[PDB]
Amino acid sequence: NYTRPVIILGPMKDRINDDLISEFPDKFGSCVPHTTRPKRDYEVDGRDYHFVTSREQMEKDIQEHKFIEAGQYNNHLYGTSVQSVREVAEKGKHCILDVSGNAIKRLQIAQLYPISIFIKPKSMFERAMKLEQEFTEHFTAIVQGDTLEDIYNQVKQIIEEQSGSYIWVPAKEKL
Template identity: 55%
Template sequence: MRSVLHNFYLKEIFTEELIRNQINHTRPVIIFGPFNEIINDRLMRDKPDKFVNCVVHTTRPRRDNEISGRDYYFVPSREQMEEDIQNHLFIEAGEYKGNLYGTSMQAVKEVSESGKHCVLDVSGHAIKRLTVAGLYPIAIFVKPPDVKWIYDNAGTDANEESAQKLYEKTVKTEQMFLDLFT
């Protein structure tokens, strides 16, 4: 009797209902790995009809040549953007030189609804936030085979120590978010 009950409880714990979601928009793309910026740039350069960045929000003052909605979305006050961050309107946000910058859910949705893939350079934590928002990102992890490969392909700025650190960071990212990669 004990094993029957034990098996019943295990079955209850490990049984999960899988639901196939109907996706009616173009999904955002997140590339992870040490050379993700190069891959992102090539996607947008080679296929601009399919891959684009979204417009980032900032509290920084607008410069003369900048247009709101094209270069940035200029948020009127730091307090407003902080409130929006607290209300989970942003996938990610951070501070640079005293100004806030962030990628909003709405900006990603606008790109997706235009029929293009929004290329994002965000942390692995953003995958869950995008999924909860119904945007279901395509999250791709590109892992170099070894430290030597990073060293050989990183250009003139690389040394063995920096290549090793980058490889270790890559392995850590893989371990933390492996279950979320597409």
């Protein structure tokens, strides 16, 4: 079938995302967003972004629900497409996504059922409080922790349980 996208929410999600990706490159990855913005020289079309030349066409695909998340930034359109998430999923990797709660439902409907993990602070912000109240019903799990190592392992363990596939296997346990 496919591999489920992963969406970390709450404080520490950027550190958790980066850590997962760099620790397990063949299990986690990001997808390629579309944009209508100009490219920089070192950027590569299809690797960094899908550089789109027709803003009209982008607006059309947005209105026709090709994107799980889309918006305007410095007068250019950006979007994370279902197809892009699917292209990571089929290659056997959890697509790490940094998107709003509203994207969760869309991915579910698109049949890319996300593992959504909210990392809830022990108060050491208010943005996180209301976020929890808004998408409580959509979270796969809630993780709280004192240390970041503790939080990280809980996250990995949930992904393990929910995907039905081990992220990492001790060498000796590979039998």
